[PDB]
């Protein structure tokens, strides 16, 4: 399975200028595009090698779409402040996430188009790509406007067609990196925490995609509720890192084993301190 996902953020800044609009686009866990409305003469810009050869008409087209979205989001933010009777003195944030998920045959599993305001659900295109869920009575104003204008039909056309087709094209153009797993490089660290306990931490570094499973066992028994897990974080080079830690009685370290599961590992790895 693969996905393409866009993330839009528009933020008003009363008394410090007009709202700022940022867009990023991902295929799976790999960013490929950005746009920042604060840039002087802003452009859609490549962030992955496999869109750098798309050509100037493509990039002009994406840039045109982002500029229109940035200007429109200024209107939307103003409308929302009016729906809610909010003060012009406060800053507010509009977010949108949209995209498509594909199955192993390249068919569309699910399309998305969800919006948030002030950090919480505002309105969402339903799974059927034909109706809306409004989070409150303000979002119901938007819903009636979008129903009258057949907004859902336009999104469905994009989600079932353009989104699927271009995701498949990006996957083929970038297959050498997008369709290749990078196995995690692993080690265990050890830190006493008192006279009688010690931290064992299992590290996974340099892996792609981000999905990974790190577990600790005591004499073979899973230690699920005693394992502290950090959220998977970016290394900065397109790969990821994660650690999982357990606090154990001093002198009992030898009972514990770390287990690592990743697409890049044909067999799970076991580590011990």
């Amino acid at each position: 399975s693969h996905s393409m996902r866009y993330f839009y953020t528009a933020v008003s800044r009363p008394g410090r200028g007009e709202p700022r609009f940022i867009a990023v686009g991902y295929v799976d866990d790999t960013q490929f595009v950005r746009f920042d409305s604060d840039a002087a003469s802003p452009r859609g810009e490549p962030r992955a090698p496999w869109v750098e050869q798309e050509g100037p008409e493509y990039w002009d087209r994406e840039t045109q779409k982002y500029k229109r979205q940035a200007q429109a989001d200024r209107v939307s933010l103003r409308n929302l402040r009016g729906y809610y009777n909010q003060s012009e003195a406060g800053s507010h944030t509009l977010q949108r996430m949209y995209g498509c998920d594909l199955g192993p045959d390249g068919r569309l599993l699910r399309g998305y188009d969800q919006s948030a305001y002030d950090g919480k659900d505002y309105i969402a295109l339903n799974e059927d790509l034909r109706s809306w869920t409004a989070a409150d009575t303000a979002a119901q104003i938007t819903q009636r406007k979008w129903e009258a204008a057949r907004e859902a039909e336009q999104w469905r056309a994009y989600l079932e067609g353009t989104c699927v087709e271009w995701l498949r094209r990006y996957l083929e153009n970038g297959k050498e990196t997008l369709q290749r797993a990078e196995h995690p490089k692993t080690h265990v660290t050890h830190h006493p925490v008192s006279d009688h306990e010690a931290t064992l931490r299992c590290w996974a570094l340099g892996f792609y995609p981000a999905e990974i499973t790190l577990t600790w066992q005591r004499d073979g028994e899973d230690q699920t509720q005693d394992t502290e897990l950090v959220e998977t974080r970016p290394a900065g080079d397109g790969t990821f890192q994660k650690w999982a830690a357990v606090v154990v009685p001093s002198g009992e370290e030898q009972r514990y084993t770390c287990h690592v599961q990743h697409e890049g590992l044909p067999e799970p790895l076991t580590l011990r301190w």
């Binding site: 779409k65 979205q69 209107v75 939307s76 188009d113 907004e151 336009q154 994009y158 353009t162």
Partner: peptide, 9 residues
């Protein structure tokens, strides 16, 4: 490839 449509909330 980004969504081409445009409609205010």
């Amino acid at each position: 490839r980004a969504f081409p449509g445009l409609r205010y909330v």
